[PDB]
Amino acid sequence: NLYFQSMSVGFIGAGQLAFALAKGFTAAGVLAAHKIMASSMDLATVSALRKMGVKLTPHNKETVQHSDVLFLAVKPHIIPFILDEIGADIEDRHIVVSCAAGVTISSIEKKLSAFRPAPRVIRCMTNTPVVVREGATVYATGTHAQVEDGRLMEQLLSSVGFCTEVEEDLIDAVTGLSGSGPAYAFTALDALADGGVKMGLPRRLAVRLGAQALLGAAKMLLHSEQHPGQLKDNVSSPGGATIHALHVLESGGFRSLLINAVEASCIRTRELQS
C-alpha cells in the first residue's frame, strides 16, 4: 500500500521509457497518473500517456515547474541540449534522474552547475519491462544527492521491478546486460518460435510456449539457491532430448555469442559517453 503522497513526477521525453515507467508506477498504485507530466508530440507513446491520465505539454519548462522528481528520458546526445534549456528552471526541490545510456553524473552536474550550484542528480539504467512491473533498474547517486534521495529513488523504482544502487562505473556493463537484455530475449523468442514452427507447431502456440519457458526458467533461477549450471544438470537426463539440443547450442558457440553481445552493448555505451 505504498503511495508517494507529496511527489510530482515529470518526464522530459515521452517515448517508450517514459510510457513504460508511468504505466508501471500507476499499475503499482504508487502514483496517480495526474501527478505525472511528460513533454515531447504526434508520437504513439504520447497518445497512450494521455489515455492513462498523464498530463502532457510540448514545453520542457512546464514539466520542470510541475515536477519534484524529474526523469530525463531522452537519447544520450539530446541531454546537453536539455540541460541548457531548463538548467535555469531547476530549483532546490528538484531531483534530476538521468536515464540516458552512458551519460555520466559528472557531465550532467557540470552542465547544470553553470546555473545553480549543487544540483541533485541520480543516474539510472532501467529497461522496458517496468511496464509489467518486472524491470531491472540500477542507480547511482550524484555528488549533491541527499541520503533520502537515493532511498526515495530506490523505493519508487522497486515498485516496478528489481532495483539496487551501484557504483556509477558499473552502469555501462549493466546496460550491456539488463538494459539490452530484453532485446536479446525477444530475438531468442522469435527464433525459438521459428524452431517450434519448423517442427510443426502453430506460430501462436510456439510463441506462447517459448515465452512461458523463458519466464519459468528465469523465475526458477531467481527463486533457487543453485548455480544455473546445476539447474541445467538437474533438467538434463542421460541420453535425452535436452542434452542433445544443448550439444548443438555448444557446437555453435551459443554461450560466446551472449558474452559477445553484453560486451558489445557495454563498449558502445562507453562510446556514447565519450
Which 70-129 positions form the footprint of Cl ion (CB under 5 A)?
127-128
Report the distance separating Cα 94 and Cα 120, nearest Å: 7
Residue 114 binding result from its own copies, Cl ion, none, given CB thresholds of 5 to 8 Å by partner type = none
| Smallest separation, CB 163 to Cl ion (Å) | 15
- If phi over 0 gives left and psi between -120 and 50 gives alpha, with beta otherwise, what is residue 244? alpha
Q: Give the nearer residue to its own copies in terms of CB position, either 148 or 169.
A: 169
24 is in an annotated binding site: no
| Smallest separation, CB 128 to Cl ion (Å) | 3
Pairing of strands 135-141, 120-125: antiparallel
Residue 141 DSSP code: E
User: Contact 129/135 with Cβ under 8 angstroms?
Assistant: yes
Residue 274 binding result from Cl ion, its own copies, none, given CB thresholds of 5 to 8 Å by partner type = none
Cα–Cα nearest to 41, from 50, 33, 32? 50
User: Contact 123/149 with Cβ under 8 angstroms?
Assistant: no
Q: Does 264 engage in binding with Cl ion (CB under 5 A)?
A: no
Q: Does 15 engage in binding with Cl ion (CB under 5 A)?
A: no
Q: Give the nearer residue to Cl ion in terms of CB position, either 45 or 113.
A: 45
155 is in an annotated binding site: no
146 is in an annotated binding site: no
Q: Give the nearer residue to Cl ion in terms of CB position, either 150 or 182.
A: 182
40 is in an annotated binding site: yes
Compute φ and ψ for 104, nearest 5 degrees. Answer: -85, 160
| Smallest separation, CB 240 to its own copies (Å) | 7
Interface residue with Cl ion among 235, 245, 264, 267 (CB under 5 A) is 235
Report the distance separating Cα 198 and Cα 193, nearest Å: 8
82 is in an annotated binding site: no
12 is in an annotated binding site: yes
Report the distance separating Cα 217 and Cα 223, nearest Å: 10
Q: How many residues bind Cl ion (CB under 5 A)?
A: 4
| Smallest separation, CB 107 to its own copies (Å) | 17
Pairing of strands 95-98, 69-72: parallel
Q: Does 175 engage in binding with Cl ion (CB under 5 A)?
A: no
Cα–Cα nearest to 140, from 110, 115, 164, 113? 164
Report the distance separating Cα 63 and Cα 67, nearest Å: 6
| Smallest separation, CB 145 to its own copies (Å) | 20
Residue 84 binding result from Cl ion, its own copies, none, given CB thresholds of 5 to 8 Å by partner type = none
DSSP-assigned letters across all residues of 56-77:
EES-HHHHHHH-SEEEE-S-GG
Interface residue with Cl ion among 45, 113, 182, 272 (CB under 5 A) is 182
Binding-site residue numbers for L-proline are 168, 241-242
Q: Which residues bind Cl ion (CB under 5 A)?
A: 127-128, 182, 235
Binding-site residue numbers are 12-17, 40, 60, 73-76, 99-101, 168, 234, 241-242
